[PDB]
Amino acid sequence: MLEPLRLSQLTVALDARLIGEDAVFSAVSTDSRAIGPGELFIALSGPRFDGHDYLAEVAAKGAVAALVEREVAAPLPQLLVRDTRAALGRLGALNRRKFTGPLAAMTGSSGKTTVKEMLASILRTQAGDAESVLATRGNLNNDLGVPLTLLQLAPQHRSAVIELGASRIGEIAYTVELTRPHVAIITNAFGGPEKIVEAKGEILEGLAADGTAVLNLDDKAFDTWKARASGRPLLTFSLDRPQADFRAADLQRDARGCMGFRLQGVAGEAQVQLNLLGRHNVANALAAAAAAHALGVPLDGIVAGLQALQPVKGRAVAQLTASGLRVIDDSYNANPASMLAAIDILSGFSGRTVLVLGDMGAEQAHREVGAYAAGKVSALYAVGPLMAHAVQAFGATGRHFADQASLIGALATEDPTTTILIKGSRSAAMDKVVAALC
Template sequence: MLIDHRLSNVSKIGNCNLVGKDAFFKKVSIDTRSISKGDIFLALSGPNYDGHDFIDEALEKGASCIITEKTIPSATHIKTDNCFLFLEKLANFQRSNFKKIIISITGSNGKTSTKEILYQLTRELFENKDEVFKSPGNWNNRLGLYLSLLRLDNSHKLAIFEIGTNAIGEIKELASFLKPNIGVITNIGNSHLEGLKNINGVLEEKTDLFSYVSSSGTCLIRAKEDHLVKAKKKIKKRKKIFLRPKDSSSFDQNLEMAEAVISCLPEEINKKFFLSEKNISDLEIKAVVPGRQELLIGKNKVNIVDDTYNANPESFKAAFKKIESISCKNKICVMGKMNELGENSLILQDEIIKEALNLFDLVLAINLDSKINAKNLKIINPKAIFKNLEIYLNEESVILFKASRSVKMDDIVKLFL
């Protein structure tokens, strides 16, 4: 049995006292912007914020209780020494009491997209589609995992979680907490190299997931042969499915991985699986993730590929595959910085610029430090983007926008919609 949605039950799990009247609650929230009447507000604090500053706002919006490190006169609350550790206790209770199938997905690219495809496909395998749960958005760090676990309820029969990393030890921490039945690594590539050092560091970190898959579970990975040899050491005697890297679109590769995962589910579930051409076409629409190779129609019917959520060399190459599949007279790439690539960042950046120059009629590099000299390359500041793109704003053009999140390329895309 998962958490009974009563305040007294929550306080008991956290080993703290409830001050005020017992009541039912809807969900636990850490953000007053999305809080609803009857929710618990957890006053988390971080390096740049203190949730206690928003307690009054939470109460005004109808919070039924505050989990706090401070005493609150005249308000129902649960006082704890550490709000984050309190959240961890709740999440651990949820995981310990969830006895159904858990799937955990990581990888250098395609985590969220694979999760979305798998979610859409598995929903069709249950009588009630709501029996399948997925972690929201990209909630793939420790906080995101804990909050995701709190959203599980007794109706769920399958739960899909995404976990991420940018430093050594993070996958171990998340996977050991989640203990999945099925572990999925979408691929191994040059990502988060500041923390993981090199491709071998990425491989070592990502494959830590397999060490915490249940002994009767299955491990799936798409990787080169030499990487598979190393992965086997952590897979040990668990069942395994190996997929080789392919020169195909991101969608096709993510779909192939999702199908492989479904083959690992119990027969009474996966025997219902059938995928027609129409299903695939519908899936390409349903499983679209905002900011991840999202095809949009902009001003003057210009075609836009919004891939602004994040960037690394492998995801750039995947985006180029997407552009190759689009028939347009003019192809333009607006690219920005790729973060967390470590000491070889400029080398990796220039490799991507060179690939882009072979595909695109024009490459606009925003504030990039590069010595590459080419007729179809312009290094510009953000203010010059519209001026350089104005003549291409028509239905005969496709424009790819891509950069790491910190560049805020998504705000630039909005100018052309």
């Protein structure tokens, strides 16, 4: 928060009644399992629990008051409102309006998180100060996550990078109104494909008349979004089109498989080597570049921020071993969805490819993973009792191993130009296989 807030001064803003003594809070929590002294507890009703049941617990941990939508017959002061979700929203908006620094917001696919992390890297590198830039923590990006994020804005922040997510029409329109960005980015596009396009376009309505929209010229929804931008300043990005404001030429993988390119367009020209796999991440880099340009960052800061960004440990971390093997460490976690994506990542390499799996934390889901890999990778090597079903479904170039030591022994024979991707749920400990090779 920009400053502490007093209960009696929020009755107008929140249309609330104060019950009990006045109090001053300096942060908020929506969870009695993570609250401490000085904090306002906000009681939310959910599908499993009701925050209103935990007033004794928050009071004993030092919460100064509770925001509630019914009066509990209570161990601390209550600020009573009609809707605690809506009141949280108002508190987010209220705190945002005390923040005077540059603020960008982004939505689209899961690419939005990557654009957030790219842009945050750019801003923090340019500033030489990571704590001076606020960015949405994880995916705290919905009708609750956005205002909780805006409530983190504090006197040390000089700029902010907010992610907005949606699973319905109206959600982004609500949160972007709280957020009021100077720059809004849509990476790409509920009730169907046109509903998705309408939802993502809501981010543009949160811009002022001179706010900048960052749009993908390659997206089928470009025309619709440009129309909805209604004349606001626009920066475009493309992998294909010479007229886009931000462009990439000479896309090339380095030895790890990480994408490099030549940035072109209105910020100038420069070579950029990312530490990330995938052609689509070049497009995310262009969107981050455009947003940073709009916020005043020079070419060399854009380049340095993009090259500084590292993948999260155990999440598609590509690297070369001493023996010239390409190893993609995806060993953090796994489920059916993420297995399928990993297979598709590995399928983009042209040499021998080897998918290396441990059990997902049933037997049909393992069959489905094995069968989906057939036709996309050269071999499937796996360990774990459930993964026998994957190997069997995959076919004759699959191998099942009775333990990690024999799996590692097989992999130690793989030759340069081969690419290996290692993945399992946290319980499989496939990070040990990565450690043995790297």
